[PDB]
Design a binder for this molecule. Structure first.
Ligand code: 2NC
Length: 99
């Protein structure tokens, strides 16, 4: 699709068998999802943003479907204000910025 930016670029994703809503985020290196159970093992990490740092659980090689497009990669789980799809997965679905 072509998505304009008058509204937040929110889309449906599937992760761990469950549907969620997430923000397509060119300003995020990584994909960060609200607290949930994910199958498999994780390792702790800290990530930063506009206000400081939070602690997350890093899961690797997680399948994520984003608006019907498949990705498999790193998903960070923790107390993010908004579910965000970052560049690590945006590149897998061939997403670009255009103007
Ligand atoms: C979570 C809230 C929504 C997404 C977030 C993405 N902003 C980028 C900006 C880059 C830093 C300025 C971001 O957080 N990126 C992180 C996302 C986390 C991630 N792991 O990818 C990032 O790339 N972080 C890397 C980059 C390095 C940071 N610096 C450092 N480590 N020293 C990371 N590994 O820490 N947007 C925002 O922070 C904006 N918030 C919003 O638009 C709305 N606020 C809320 C709460 O939704 C609105 C109601 O204000 C700010 C700028 C106000 C306009």
């Amino acid at each position: 699709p072509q998505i304009t930016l008058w509204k937040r670029p929110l889309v449906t994703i599937r992760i761990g068998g469950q549907l969620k809503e997430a923000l397509l985020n060119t300003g995020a290196d990584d994909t960060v999802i609200e607290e949930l159970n994910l199958p498999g093992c994780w390792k702790p990490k800290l990530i930063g943003g506009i206000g400081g740092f939070i602690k997350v659980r890093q899961y690797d090689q997680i399948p994520v479907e984003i608006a019907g497009h498949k990705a498999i990669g790193t998903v960070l789980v923790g107390p993010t204000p908004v579910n965000i799809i970052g560049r690590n997965l945006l590149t897998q679905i061939g997403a670009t910025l255009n103007f």
